[PDB]
Structure 1
């Protein structure tokens, strides 16, 4: 059995195997952490299949939702990984031992070392973390050399007609921009977004939450269109000065090592280019 260490946000159901061989991930937040720890994923989520970075490493995995109990059963998992919002752990636990993670209890870096502790891969985890911290601190200097040290960044995501602001730990590049590069945010973003993590926003207050730079995540090119054509949007200094970094949500939603590596290089190149 796994030693099953007690970790904030981690709940074990059943007897976690010490070396899982057939993992079903039902939480795209964590799939790429498992991948990075060279675990064999035999089921993954829609989001994971849509992630152009991660998808390449899980081609053999079946796409499964939590609602596909029969499909999951057929995969013969020895471990199922879920987010704590999953409402039917009860039936999942009847199929295989389940690990449930409550989002945000541990940070984007701790999550990896935590899995290291659970699954006997603290070596592989600690190597990645050390190199990550090195590379990021270097890149931070490079990017701040261009923008200045006090440049403000806002993280933004578009979905359908919805507009969200994000903080430092709700994906969309906020972990890299706000944590790894230690960029400040506009005042209203800090006081209204950072603690909660995200904020649904009226389009017409947007200028008040954007300073020097803005990172905007979206799943396709069309979703922006009409906002990007608006006078209000076009009146925003950061937009006028081409300080808008448009990124692909299908990878930028996540904070796993694989997604992050790509995000890190993408964001660095974008800022240097400005």
Structure 2
């Protein structure tokens, strides 16, 4: 029952899934309608909350490689420092399987996940077309963002699992960093056949009100797929299975 403090929110759902003794978890899991329920009764910390982490007495601390309080956590407990960029969503769960020694439980999760989504992918393409493209549009702080195949927002399900085709210019732009800000008037340039927009529940965003948005072919064909932003930030086994179910139905229904 080794006590883990998960400061980096990327790896919270993957450890919970494997049954880790998470005694502390990043506050930001509360934004996910999948993960909030999984972590009720678990202490919420934010960045800088070293004593909040310390007080729950962790045997292990998990932080990002860009976390500034690493030396502070090193004084509290053994700190596993994780470079996000180093592993993709499946390899990332393999790593968490090592942390808790459930490496064989992950190999079975991976196999079933890959089987189901590949088979899902053949089905999705049957409705929308083999080379039908999907775009990612995400607003935060009134800025517009798009992503590669491994930066949340459904990308790892859409492009890796399902094998759907990524919008040609979105792929070029995000090939470098995995993410990129989009000029609200170059939005037509990155729009694809289908659009995943993280504006579910959100008041009609600035980019969903422009006349260029109303004139996109995806909008015209009713191919806008709206999803909750906070829920779609993640790429954990809990989130993955939800997005799998959610994206499949919303895309197929969009296909008339």
CA contact (8 A) 1:167 1:190 kept: yes
Query: Is 1:245 aligned with 2:228?
Result: no
- Return the alpha-carbon distance in structure 2 between the equivalents of residues 44 and 72 of structure 1: 9
Runs of 4+ in structure 1 off by over 4 angstroms are none
Name 1:203's counterpart in structure 2: 184
From the two aligned structures, give the one with the greater helix fraction.
2
Query: Is 1:231 aligned with 2:211?
Result: yes
1:98-109 superposed matches below 5 A:
98-109=79-90
Q: Write the deviation string for residues 106-163 of structure 1: whole angstroms up to 9, x where unpaired.
A: 1100011122123210121111111101110111011111100010111121113100
Report the Cα offset of residue 265 of structure 1: 0.3
- Return the alpha-carbon distance in structure 2 between the equivalents of residues 44 and 76 of structure 1: 13
Report the Cα offset of residue 68 of structure 1: 1.6
Choose which of 115, 122, 126 in structure 2 pairs with 1:141. Answer: 122
TM-score (norm 1): 0.89
Report which stretch shifted further, 179-188 or 247-256.
179-188
Q: Write the deviation string for residues 151-178 of structure 1: whole angstroms up to 9, x where unpaired.
A: 0111121113100111111110110111
Q: Write the deviation string for residues 205-229 of structure 1: whole angstroms up to 9, x where unpaired.
A: 111111201111247411x433222
With over 3 angstroms needed to count, the CA separation of the structure-2 counterparts of 1:225 and 1:155, relative to structure 1, is closer
Q: Secondary structure at the match of 2:86?
A: coil
TM-score (norm 2): 0.95
- Size of the alignment, in residue pairs? 254
Question: Which sections of structure 1, spanning at least 5 residues, go unmatched?
Answer: 1-19
- Return the alpha-carbon distance in structure 1 between the equivalents of residues 168 and 97 of structure 2: 37
Report the Cα offset of residue 184 of structure 1: 1.5
